[PDB]
């Protein structure tokens, strides 16, 4: 109360019942407030960023929850890391936070001038699965219902599927393009999925070894670490930031992440002990290669 120049607990403010101009009210943090988010050690300029507060009303939760793509700012993982968070309360601090310390300013690294955020692990493999041409079942298509299911949880404005019959089969590149048209860019690069070292073995689909985007229309190749991965220079999010802004780059990162995650929600992905088990012929071939290594080593020994 400015009239009394003292602070008061609302437990005894029942009779006053009102505020007045020149009064200062200390109110609980709400969704949409800006909060400073830090992880020691603070080595980079992006170690302290301003995120928007999303209050989780479930009382059983006591952790700080943040998108996996945001870890690249703080070099954090979820193996037990602890991070600091303080909500600015002064008006100058809030203005400064939301205008200068917002994490959109740190999307492009101050260190290497490239992007730091992107798709990591789950979303990278999900984008690869979604954008590839053929699945083991044949063509990589989905009906209208599952195409809409992909866009269910992107928080954007969902596109128009009124032109598709319920039995119409939408390609993965189709839905990725319907997402990328909101920020049309041009991208043409080989994907990390295509490697010369693998090439002699396994038959690469010729429609997957070259990624091409024209004005947001992804019509070629797959999306993987080179195109959407975090810290990939010249990736699609870097171009989105250059053309439309780092905030739009973060929005596109989230949207593409949700596309990939939902496509894997319906496509599934796993690693098994038999994925890493060689066939007996392959085991004999590995033995032969190692025997040749040891043979030339023993030739050195004989010399």
């Amino acid at each position: 109360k400015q009239i009394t120049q003292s602070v008061h607990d609302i437990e005894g403010l029942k009779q006053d019942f009102r505020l007045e101009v020149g009064d200062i009210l200390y109110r609980d943090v709400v969704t949409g407030d800006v909060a400073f988010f830090n992880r020691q050690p603070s080595l980079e300029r992006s170690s302290i960023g301003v995120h928007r507060i999303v209050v989780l009303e479930n009382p059983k939760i006591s952790t700080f929850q943040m998108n996996v793509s945001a870890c690249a700012w703080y070099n954090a993982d979820f193996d037990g890391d602890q991070m600091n968070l303080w909500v600015p309360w002064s008006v100058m601090s809030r203005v400064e936070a939301e205008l200068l310390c917002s994490v959109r300013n740190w999307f492009i690294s101050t260190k290497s001038s490239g992007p730091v955020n992107g798709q990591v692990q789950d979303s990278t493999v999900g984008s690869f699965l979604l954008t590839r041409t053929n699945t083991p079942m044949g063509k990589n298509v989905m009906n209208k219902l599952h195409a809409m299911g992909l866009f269910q949880t992107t928080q954007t404005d969902p596109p128009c599927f009124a032109n598709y019959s319920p039995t119409d089969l939408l390609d993965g590149k189709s839905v990725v393009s319907m997402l990328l048209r909101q920020t049309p860019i041009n991208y043409q690069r080989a994907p990390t999925w295509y490697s010369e070292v693998y090439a002699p073995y396994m038959h690469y689909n010729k429609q997957d070894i070259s990624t091409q985007i024209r004005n947001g229309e992804l019509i070629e190749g797959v999306l993987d670490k080179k195109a959407v991965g975090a810290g990939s220079s010249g990736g699609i999010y870097h171009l989105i930031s250059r053309r439309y802004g780092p905030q739009q780059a973060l929005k596109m990162i989230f949207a593409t992440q949700q596309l990939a995650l939902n496509y894997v929600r319906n496509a599934g992905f796993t690693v098994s002990t038999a994925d890493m088990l060689l066939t007996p012929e392959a085991h004999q071939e590995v033995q032969e290669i190692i025997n040749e290594l040891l043979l030339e080593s023993e030739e050195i020994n004989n010399r």
């Binding site: 006591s62 952790t63 929600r265 796993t270 002990t273 038999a274 890493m276």
Partner: protein, 195 residues
């Protein structure tokens, strides 16, 4: 008179269970009460398999939302497949692929280090147990009921709850509290109740 009473302090409510006022070495009495806390596995508590893969528990999915196999089996923990290749913790996967057959046969096996092991023969044991050669099974998405296209590797992996609790480590202090007398700054740490 004057007051030197002790305040509880901790945000997490506790229960008292201690009837004792002992007789110390200096021949004087002291309190020594014991507080009991009800600790389930909260979101944020750390777990780890015997191969050294730590992981913070962040999801509380009801039993209906959990993915389930064709024959009703659902997991307790869902761990990301990406946690394996960089760490090369193949012991965890072999433990799972042996534990499936062991659970089906109702046996317990020795997986001590440097004992003879044949991954091919363990997988053939899985096959002769009625499951697939790999531990993979047909799972259905719990939320939507749709089946995943890829057969999912699911089995019993021994897991440990590391004693780094979220409720112990979380802290939040308001705009006031105890201050250091010398520099006028808040005291250090959660124990000092500020800073």
């Amino acid at each position: 008179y004057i007051d030197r009473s002790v305040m509880y302090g901790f945000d997490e409510p506790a229960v008292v269970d201690a009837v004792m006022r002992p007789h110390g070495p200096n021949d004087e009495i002291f309190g020594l009460m014991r507080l009991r806390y009800e600790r389930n596995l909260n979101i944020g508590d750390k777990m780890s398999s015997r191969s050294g893969n730590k992981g913070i528990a962040a999801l509380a999915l009801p039993t209906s939302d959990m993915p389930f196999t064709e024959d009703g089996l659902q997991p307790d923990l869902i761990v990301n497949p990406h946690s394996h290749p960089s760490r090369m913790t193949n012991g965890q996967m072999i433990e799972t692929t042996v534990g499936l057959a062991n659970a089906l046969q109702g046996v317990v096996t020795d997986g001590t280090a440097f004992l003879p092991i044949n991954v091919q023969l363990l997988s053939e044991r899985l096959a002769q147990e009625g499951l697939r050669f790999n531990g993979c099974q047909k799972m259905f998405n719990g939320q939507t009921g749709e089946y995943f296209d890829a057969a999912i590797f699911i089995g019993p992996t021994y897991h440990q709850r590391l004693q780094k609790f979220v409720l112990d480590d979380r802290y939040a202090v308001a705009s006031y509290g105890p201050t250091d007398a010398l520099t006028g700054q808040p005291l250090d740490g959660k124990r000092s109740h500020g800073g």
